[PDB]
Symmetry: C2
Subunit: 77 residues, 2 copies
């Protein structure tokens, strides 16, 4: 499913965003992050972000740990 791409994208966000970024900044980064993942991921990534944006922003404000985040949103089962 979306598990591995989720961890890769949230991994990017964690390393390249700051600890207390605004939902707005989380959104801007989230909608630009797929382009920095390895090429074979880029389309899968956009789909994941599209299906999951609402829940992703709601959780990333609290915590940006790739393993936890992807688990919580059900992306990693």
């Amino acid at each position: 499913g979306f598990c591995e791409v989720c961890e890769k994208l949230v991994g990017y966000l964690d390393r390249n965003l700051e600890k207390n970024s605004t939902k707005q900044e989380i959104l801007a980064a989230l909608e630009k992050g797929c382009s920095f993942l390895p090429d074979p991921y880029q389309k899968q990534c956009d789909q994941f972000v599209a299906e999951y944006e609402p829940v992703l922003i709601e959780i990333l404000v609290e915590v940006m740990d790739p393993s936890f985040v992807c688990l919580k949103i059900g992306a990693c089962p």
Copy 2:
């Protein structure tokens, strides 16, 4: 609609490069290698689409391989 675009590319690839009266085993084989021939940005999405729809993809691809119709019938599009 999230798998719609990649469905059509993949079934499109198979439509051009596979013979009309191919066995299920040959289509299975084509299908599980097809993603590697799509543009790199589609690879992991294609792998996911295939894994998710493979049973019904084989079922239909023996009868018809038109990308637009096949993706409509299986629920990938539109």
